[PDB]
């Protein structure tokens, strides 16, 4: 498998992108 659920950008917490592209500076957008 890949990682349990989709890559919800562990750097932000949203399903759709990876922290490598996390455009959310923790609580902001
Ligand atoms: Zn993100």
Domain extent, residue 26, equals 1-29
- The count of structural domains within the chain is 1
Residue with structure tokens 């890559």?
Answer: 7
User: Can you spell out the DSSP letters for 5-19?
Assistant: S---TTTT--TTS-G
Pair 23, 11: CB distance under 8 Å:
no
Pair 18, 12: CB distance under 8 Å:
no
How many A from CA of 24 to the centre of ligand 1? 5
Pair 22, 13: CB distance under 8 Å:
no
How many A from CA of 6 to the centre of ligand 1? 12
């Amino acid at each position: 498998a890949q990682q349990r659920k989709v890559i919800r950008c562990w750097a932000c917490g949203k399903e759709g992108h990876s922290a490598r592209q996390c455009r959310a500076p923790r609580r902001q957008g």
